[PDB]
Every structure is written in structure tokens, then in C-alpha cells.
Amino acid sequence: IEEGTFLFTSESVGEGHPDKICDQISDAVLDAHLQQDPDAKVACETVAKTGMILLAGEITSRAAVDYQKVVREAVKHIGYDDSSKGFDYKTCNVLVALEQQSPDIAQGVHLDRNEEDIGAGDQGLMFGYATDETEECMPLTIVLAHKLNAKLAELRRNGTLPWLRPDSKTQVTVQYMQDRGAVLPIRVHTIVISVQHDEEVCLDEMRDALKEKVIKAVVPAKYLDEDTIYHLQPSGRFVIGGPQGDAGLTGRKIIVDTYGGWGAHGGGAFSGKDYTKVDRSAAYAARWVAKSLVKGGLCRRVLVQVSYAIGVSHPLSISIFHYGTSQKSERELLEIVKKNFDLRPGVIVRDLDLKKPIYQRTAAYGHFGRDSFPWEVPKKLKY
Amino acid sequence: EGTFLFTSESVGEGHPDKICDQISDAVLDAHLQQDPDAKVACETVAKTGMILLAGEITSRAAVDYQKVVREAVKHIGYDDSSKGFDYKTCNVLVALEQQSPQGLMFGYATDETEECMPLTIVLAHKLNAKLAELRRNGTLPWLRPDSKTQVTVQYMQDRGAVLPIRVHTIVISVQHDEEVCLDEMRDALKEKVIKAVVPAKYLDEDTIYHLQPSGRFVIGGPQGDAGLTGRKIIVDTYGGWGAHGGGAFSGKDYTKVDRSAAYAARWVAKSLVKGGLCRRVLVQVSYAIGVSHPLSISIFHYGTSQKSERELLEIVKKNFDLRPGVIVRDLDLKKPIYQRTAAYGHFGRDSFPWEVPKKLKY
Amino acid sequence: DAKVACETVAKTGMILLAGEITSRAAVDYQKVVREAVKHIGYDDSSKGF
Numbered sequence: 001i002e003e004g005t006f007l008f009t010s011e012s013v014g015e016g017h018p019d020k021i022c023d024q025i026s027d028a029v030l031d032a033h034l035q036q037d038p039d040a041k042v043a044c045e046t047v048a049k050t051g052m053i054l055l056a057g058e059i060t061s062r063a064a065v066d067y068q069k070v071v072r073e074a075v076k077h078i079g080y081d082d083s084s085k086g087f088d089y090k091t092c093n094v095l096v097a098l099e100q101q102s103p104d105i106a107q108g109v110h111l112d113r114n115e116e117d118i119g120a121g122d123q124g125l126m127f128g129y130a131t132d133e134t135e136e137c138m139p140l141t142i143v144l145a146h147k148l149n150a151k152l153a154e155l156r157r158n159g160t161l162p163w164l165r166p167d168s169k170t171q172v173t174v175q176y177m178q179d180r181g182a183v184l185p186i187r188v189h190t191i192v193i194s195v196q197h198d199e200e201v202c203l204d205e206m207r208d209a210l211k212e213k214v215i216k217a218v219v220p221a222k223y224l225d226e227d228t229i230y231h232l233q234p235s236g237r238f239v240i241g242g243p244q245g246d247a248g249l250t251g252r253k254i255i256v257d258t259y260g261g262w263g264a265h266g267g268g269a270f271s272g273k274d275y276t277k278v279d280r281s282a283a284y285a286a287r288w289v290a291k292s293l294v295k296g297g298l299c300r301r302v303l304v305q306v307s308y309a310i311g312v313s314h315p316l317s318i319s320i321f322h323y324g325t326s327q328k329s330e331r332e333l334l335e336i337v338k339k340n341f342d343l344r345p346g347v348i349v350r351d352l353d354l355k356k357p358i359y360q361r362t363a364a365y366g367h368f369g370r371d372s373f374p375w376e377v378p379k380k381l382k383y
Numbered sequence: 384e385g386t387f388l389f390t391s392e393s394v395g396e397g398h399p400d401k402i403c404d405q406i407s408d409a410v411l412d413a414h415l416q417q418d419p420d421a422k423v424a425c426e427t428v429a430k431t432g433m434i435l436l437a438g439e440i441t442s443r444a445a446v447d448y449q450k451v452v453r454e455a456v457k458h459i460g461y462d463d464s465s466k467g468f469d470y471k472t473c474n475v476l477v478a479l480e481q482q483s484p485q486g487l488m489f490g491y492a493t494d495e496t497e498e499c500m501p502l503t504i505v506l507a508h509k510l511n512a513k514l515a516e517l518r519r520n521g522t523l524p525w526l527r528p529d530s531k532t533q534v535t536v537q538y539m540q541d542r543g544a545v546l547p548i549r550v551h552t553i554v555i556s557v558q559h560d561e562e563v564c565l566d567e568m569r570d571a572l573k574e575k576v577i578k579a580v581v582p583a584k585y586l587d588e589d590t591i592y593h594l595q596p597s598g599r600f601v602i603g604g605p606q607g608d609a610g611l612t613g614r615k616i617i618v619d620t621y622g623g624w625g626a627h628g629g630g631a632f633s634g635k636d637y638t639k640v641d642r643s644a645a646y647a648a649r650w651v652a653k654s655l656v657k658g659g660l661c662r663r664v665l666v667q668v669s670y671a672i673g674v675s676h677p678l679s680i681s682i683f684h685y686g687t688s689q690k691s692e693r694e695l696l697e698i699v700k701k702n703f704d705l706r707p708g709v710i711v712r713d714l715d716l717k718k719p720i721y722q723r724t725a726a727y728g729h730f731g732r733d734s735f736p737w738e739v740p741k742k743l744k745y
Numbered sequence: 746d747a748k749v750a751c752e753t754v755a756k757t758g759m760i761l762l763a764g765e766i767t768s769r770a771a772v773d774y775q776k777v778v779r780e781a782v783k784h785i786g787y788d789d790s791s792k793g794f
């Protein structure tokens with residue numbers, strides 16, 4: 001029997017996954033610049049590889065930044081500090097290939113303009129999405145996936161599971177049922193967890209620990225039953241992880257960073273980018289809008305699209321899809337959005353306080369669904 | 384009025400990120416020619432005067448990476464320092480670790496174009512193709528390889544399907560030389576590029592044109608913006624439509640299910656629409672650890688099918704075998720034709736096996 | 746009083762700086778390297794660099 005049921009799955013990766021190392025390093029570099037120069041123009045790409053971190057991209061800033069220190073301190077905090085773990089901050093190669101921002105981009109975007117008039121730093125499309133299925137207005141699949149990795153990191157850093165290393169991958173498969181445009185998560189179907197580990201600890205001590213200390217502490221019992229499949233350390237000997245024998249890049253976990261397959265994505269990455277890059281600021285803005293609509297009671301689920309042209313301040317297009325979860329028309333919801341939001345980057349930066357150096361926080365465990373971020377605090381709407 | 388806008392973008396061959404995708408798949412192609420069973424996971428990074436290869440390779444082939452990268456950059460059009468990049472003089476760095484011898488995928492199809500793709504991205508892709516073509520002709524010799532495009536189309540909802548009405552907005556940014564002036568570029572982009580790509584019935588007096596909106600675009604390619612493999616995955620796929628699980632395509636060989644099953648899911652989706660069973664469809668394939676066949680397949684036909692989801696699933700099960708091994712055999716995925724996929728989108732063009740609709744028997 | 750031990754590598758398309766510097770100075774290495782190459786006279790593909 002089936003009705004209108006389906007499976008959906010989302011992954012998250014821990015801080016030590018090579019791609020997410022790059023994301024966090026790029027955001028550490030951005031924060032370092034914003035501490036001294038709030039108007040810094042940053043486009044930092046990081047590359048992680050056996051024994052190597054390379055910084056490539058472009059930065060115009062008044063800050064004096066010691067790239068060797070910021071990169072190595074980041075790798076330190078992530079937990080790579082010895083050969084035994086496959087990577088050491090003290091002894092890794094750090095190359096830097098950073099130049100100024102193209103003057104052609106500067107003149108065309110932000111030079112000699114009032115803040116509210118600065119153009120989009122690029123063309124692009126960005127999506128925002130919210131769903132009433134969790135308190136945090138996010139898909140349960142991605143939320144559980146993130147929180148599992150966060151738990152592993154927690155239990156690693158407070159010594160309670162000292163055999164854990166920084167690299168990890170989780171996949172949460174939830175069984176869903178459609179409900180008049182909304183989606184009801186019914187049960188957790190499958191949970192996969194691969195995590196990098198000590199030489200000493202035996203396989204089934206880890207597996208016991210992943211179930212009893214990680215999953216039990218994270219996933220409400222209401223979603224777990226006797227049929228739920230657990231794939232804990234499925235391959236077995238995952239002692240080799242992180243950059244060693246692997247190659248990661250900034251912006252190769254954009255789906256993990258956002259909605260875990262749900263809603264939509266326009267393909268712009270977040271990390272290493274100041275507010276003038278609308279891939280970040282407009283995506284943050286669009287999440288804010290989507291969450292505001294659902295928390296404001298105007299719909300149970302929603303997807304928002306916005307687009308920009310480089311050097312132009314106002315969005316080229318804005319669109320709302322409520323999946324038929326609102327009594328009001330999508331056009332009416334658009335009218336409400338137009339009245340309550342100003343989606344130019346020069347304004348978004350004020351409303352969301354995006355010159356603050358708090359970006360490294362966002363580089364793991366997802367950019368959405370968390371308490372402290374301005375874009376997760378819904379706006380009271382007037383209509 | 385039941386009307387909505389949707390936007391998609393695409394980029395040119397000279398776009399830093401697309402440069403990297405093409406080189407990554409050029410490395411793959413070259414390996415597959417000598418060794419059909421080569422394992423490749425090759426990332427490319429691009430920046431002023433630099434091409435860096437990084438990744439894992441288990442292959443019997445001996446590849447001249449120098450020649451591979453340099454011929455790729457040549458083909459793309461970067462052949463002088465005046466253009467910001469030159470195949471003859473760039474730095475090629477190799478850091479590949481070579482040796483000697485699960486997932487959720489989405490496929491999507493819509494009947495709004497012959498190629499069975501969203502109009503927004505099809506046009507975006509074709510505008511870049513046109514620029515490349517007119518650059519290579521000599522018709523517009525001030526053009527340079529790096530370019531971006533973005534198309535916003537006004538749609539009308541029609542019982543599950545989406546009906547294009549008009550083009551709302553068009554963006555074109557293309558790197559250029561230092562002689563040509565701004566009015567000449569804008570006239571040309573409008574009259575020689577757009578009007579040769581977009582059907583006239585979609586263009587009108589209200590269509591907005593942002594052409595060379597930055598005002599100057601001389602500095603381009605890896606000099607103006609670092610490039611990385613796998614940073615244009617929405618451009619590679621459905622331009623904001625359908626759905627995407629996370630995996631990049633280029634630099635990966637056919638044994639990665641992220642690539643080859645995404646191709647297969649597309650094949651199914653297109654076959655359903657071309658077979659008249661749907662006007663629009665999204666195909667979900669869940670794979671699971673320790674099973675060859677998909678663990679579960681869902682089919683969202685948006686109410687455009689007369690047949691139910693269970694009926695469409697049954698049709699899918701007797702015409703398709705979605706076990707990785709069979710997919711690479713059926714679609715001929717061991718062959719070295721991955722470089723042509725690395726610009727202008729992986730879906731939409733008939734030349735690919737997964738874009739050949741299967742005649743369905745039910 | 747800067748402590749400087751800078752080794753430079755030069756090949757097709759590349760200048761690599763490798764070594765050890767402890768200094769209170771703010772040096773833009775990109776400009777400094779490019780300016781020196783400009784002064785040597787390598788300013789076009791037709792010269793090989």
C-alpha cells in the first residue's frame with residue numbers, strides 16, 4: 001500500500017570533510033578581513049588536498065591579514081594536528097594566490113555609489129525556502145543530518161568520545177506523506193553515518209556509540225521504530241579521511257549548505273564572499289522572506305526566487321510558489337513581499353547586519369535553521 | 384493572473400568555472416581512450432596564469448597533462464596575454480595521486496521545448512553558444528571567450544504544465560577587447576545574438592535588456608575570477624527547475640553514480656514526456672547501500688499524466704534497468720565523450736545517449 | 746630590521762615565493778613581483794612571459 005507516500009534523503013558532512021574544510025577556511029579569511037575593514041571585497045576560494053591548502057581568488061581590503069595564521073588556526077580548530085590523522089596544521093603546505101578585485105568589476109558594481117545603490121556583485125538566481133514540518137522551518141531530513149554531525153563534533157571536543165576524528169558523512173532518509181501541498185514526515189527510514197576514527201577503537205564499540213550517544217541524543221523517538229535501518233560505519237575501516245588521499249574545494253557542498261535537496265537552488269556558493277556577492281546576501285534574504293511567510297501564517301510551505309544583473313541594484317525578478325498551501329494567491333503573496341522587503345544588496349546588508357564577521361559559524365552544519373542568525377528571525381509583516 | 388516569472392542562467396566556454404569543468408572532463412576523456420576502466424576524480428582550479436590539477440586517478444593510461452590542458456585552453460580561445468590568459472604560456476601544475484590497478488538522483492523533463500527542457504535555460508545556453516560561434520567566425524571579432532547569460536521567462540500555469548508566454552528580461556555579459564565601444568556591443572548583442580536565438584514571438588517592446596550592464600568587461604577569464612571544477616551544477620542541469628541532490632559531474636568517471644544515474648534519470652524523464660505519458664515530470668531515484676536496483680522510485684507528473692504514479696512506475700520498471708552497471712552499458716558511458724558535456728549543459732542536446740528517447744512498450 | 750630569507754622560483758607562467766620573513770612591513774607581494782618582471786621587460790606572450 002502507498003497512497004501519496006515517498007522517500008526523501010539529505011546529507012550533511014562534518015567539518016573535516018575536505019570540501020567543508022575549504023568552506024570554513026574561506027569564511028575564516030572573510031571574517032579576518034571584516035574584523036578590520038567592514039567594506040572589504042572578498043572572493044576567497046580555498047583548495048584542500050594531501051598536505052596542501054591553496055587560497056585562490058580576489059580581495060580588495062584595508063586589513064592586514066596573515067594568511068598563514070588564519071589558515072593554520074582554522075585547520076587547528078577543525079582538529080587536524082598530527083600525521084596520524086592524515087593532516088597537520090603545524091606542518092601542512094599553505095599556498096596563497098590572491099589578487100585585488102578586478103577594477104572592471106569595482107567600477108561596475110560599487111565604486112562612487114551610495115550604499116543603497118550598489119549593484120549586484122554578479123548576475124545570478126537565488127532561492128529561499130521554508131516548511132512548517134519542523135520548528136526551525138526546515139526539512140527534517142537535512143536538520144537531522146546536520147545535527148548528527150554537530151553531535152559527533154561535540155562528543156569529540158569534550159573528550160566523551162576521544163576516538164572520533166574530524167571527517168564525517170551522514171545521510172538521513174525520511175518517509176514522507178503529502179498533505180495538501182505541505183509534507184508530513186512520518187518516520188525515519190534509514191540513517192547512514194560514516195565517521196573518521198582512531199586506530200585502537202573496535203568496530204562495534206563505535207556502532208554502539210553512534211546509536212546510543214549520537215542518534216538517541218538527536219532524533220526524537222517519535223520518528224524511530226523497529227524497522228528503521230541503521231548503516232553505522234558501513235564499509236568498516238574508515239581510518240583514512242580528511243584531505244589525505246582526497247581533493248576538496250570551496251562551494252562543493254551547496255546543497256548541504258541549504259535545503260538538502262528540497263526547494264531549489266540557483267547554484268551560487270556562499271563561503272568566501274562578502275555581502276556584495278548576491279549568491280550569499282540574496283539567498284540569506286530569500287530564506288528570511290520564506291521563513292517570515294510561514295511563521296507569519298500565510299502558508300505552510302513556500303519557495304521564493306530572486307534574480308539579479310551585475311551592476312544593477314533592484315532584483316530583475318521575484319517569484320513565489322506556495323505549493324497551494326495558502327488561501328491567498330501567489331500573486332497576493334508577492335504583493336505582500338514587495339511591500340515588506342527591499343532586496344537590494346545595499347539594503348539587505350543593513351537589515352541582516354552582513355558586515356559582521358560571523359560567517360565562519362555558517363560554514364558547517366548548514367546556513368539555515370539556526371537560532372542566532374538575523375535571517376532566521378522572521379519579520380512581522382503588514383498587509 | 385496565474386502568471387509567474389522564472390529565471391535561469393548559463394555561462395560560456397571561457398568562464399573560469401566552465402574552463403575547469405572542460406579540462407577535468409578532458410583529463411577524463413584522455414584517460415578513457417587508453418583505459419576504458421580508468422577511475423578518475425579530477426578537480427581543476429584556475430586563476431591568473433595557472434591551471435592546477437588535483438585528485439585521485441587509478442588508471443593504466445599515460446597522459447600528457449601538459450598537452451591535454453593546453454589544447455583545451457586553446458580550443459576555448461585563450462591564446463594571448465592581451466586576453467588575460469594564454470595556452471602557450473600558462474602555468475600547469477599537476478598534483479594528481481595516480482595508482483595502478485548511497486545516493487538520491489533526480490531526472491526532469493518538460494514539454495515546453497523540442498529539447499524537452501525549460502525554455503529559460505535552453506535560451507541561456509544558446510545565447511552563449513551563439514557568442515562563441517560569432518567569436519570564432521570572425522563576425523564579432525571583439526568578443527572574447529568568458530561570458531554569462533540569464534533569461535527570465537514569463538510563464539502561465541496550465542493544468543500541471545507551464546506555458547511560456549514571453550521573455551521578460553535578458554542579461555548578457557561578455558568579455559571584450561579595448562577598441563569596440565559600448566553602443567556597438569549592445570546593438571550587436573541585441574541584433575546578431577538575441578534575435579538569432581530567441582523566437583520572435585517571445586520578444587516584444589516590453590522585454591528588458593541588460594546588455595554589458597557592468598559597463599566594462601576587458602579583464603576576464605581566470606584573471607577576473609578564480610575558477611573551480613563543479614561550481615556550475617545548476618547550469619549543468621535544470622537551471623533552477625527539477626531538483627538536485629548535490630553531486631558535480633565533471634572530472635568523475637562513469638563508476639560514480641552521481642553522474643551516470645543522473646544521466647539515466649534524465650533519460651527516463653525525457654522518455655516519459657516524448658512518449659506522451661507526461662507533459663512534465665520529475666523522476667526520483669533512491670539508491671541504497673547493498674542493492675543493485677533502486678530502493679525506491681517516485682514520479683511526480685504534476686497531474687499531467689492520465690495514468691497514475693503506480694502505472695507510470697510499472698511502465699518504467701519493464702522498459703528500464705537502473706542498475707549502475709547496466710546504465711553504463713546501455714548508454715555507452717565508457718567512451719571518451721565527456722568533454723562535450725562540460726559546457727552548454729549536460730541535458731538538452733540530442734547528441735548524447737541519455738537524450739535519445741527510448742520507445743516505450745507497455 | 747626585517748628578517749628576510751626569500752627564495753624565488755621562476756618557470757613557464759609562474760613566479761613562486763618560498764621562504765621565511767618576519768617583518769613589521771605591509772608588503773603586497775603581487776605588485777612587488779609583477780613590477781620587477783615589468784622592469785625586467787617581460788610584458789607579452791610574444792616574449793614568452
Ligand SMILES: C[S@@+](CC[C@H](N)C(=O)[O-])C[C@H]1O[C@@H](n2cnc3c(N)ncnc32)[C@H](O)[C@@H]1O
Binds near residue numbers: 310
Ligand atoms: C563578477 S565575477 C565574481 C565576483 C568576483 N570574484 C569579484 O571579485 O567581485 C563572476 C563572473 O562574472 C563575469 N565577469 C567578470 N568580470 C566582469 C565584468 N567586469 N562585468 C561583467 N561580468 C564580469 C565572469 O564571467 C566571472 O567569472
Ligand SMILES: [Mg+2]
Ligand atoms: Mg562566483
Ligand SMILES: [Mg+2]
Binds near residue numbers: 400609
Ligand atoms: Mg564561480
